[PDB]
Homo-oligomer: A and B are copies of this chain.
Amino acid sequence: TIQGSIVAIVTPMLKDGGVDWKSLEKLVEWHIEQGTNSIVAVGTTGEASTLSMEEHTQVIKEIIRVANKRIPIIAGTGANSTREAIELTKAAKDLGADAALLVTPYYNKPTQEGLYQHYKAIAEAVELPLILYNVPGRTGVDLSNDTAVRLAEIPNIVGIKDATGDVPRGKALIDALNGKMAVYSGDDETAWELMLLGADGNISVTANIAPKAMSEVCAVAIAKDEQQAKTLNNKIANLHNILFCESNPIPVKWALHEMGLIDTGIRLPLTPLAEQYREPLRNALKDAGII
Q: Which residues of A contact B (CB under 8 A)?
A: 44, 47, 49-50, 80-83, 103, 105-111, 113-115, 117-118, 121, 137-140, 246-247, 250, 267-271, 274
A137: B residues at CB distance < 8 A: 140
6 pairs from A and B in contact (CB 8 Å cutoff)? A49-B81, A50-B108, A106-B107, A107-B139, A111-B274, A139-B140
Complex partner residue of A268 from B118, B250, B269, CB under 8 angstroms: B118
Pairwise interchain contact B81-A111, C-beta atoms closer than 8 A: no
Contact: B115 with A269, CB < 8 Å?
A: yes
Distance between A125 CB and nearest chain B CB, rounded to angstroms: 11
- With A and B bound together, what is the CA distance between A239 and B270 in angstroms? 38
Pick from B50, B114, B247: contact of A269, CB below 8 A. Answer: B114
Q: List chain B residues, Cβ under 8 A from A140.
A: 106, 137-140
Q: Is the CB of B114 within 8 A of A271?
A: yes
Taken together as a complex, chains A and B put the C-alpha atoms of A114 and B107 apart, in Å, by: 19
What is the distance, in angstroms, from A201's C-beta to the closest C-beta of chain B? 23
- Closest partner residue, chain B, to A86 (CB atom): B268
Partner of A271, one of B49, B107, B117, B270: B117
The answer for the CA separation of A110 and B80 in the assembled complex, in Å, is: 18
Q: Which residues of B contact A107 (CB under 8 A)?
A: 44, 49, 103, 106-107, 138-139
**Complex Cα–Cα for A33 and B82 (A):** 36
CB of B138 within 8 A of CB of A247, answer no
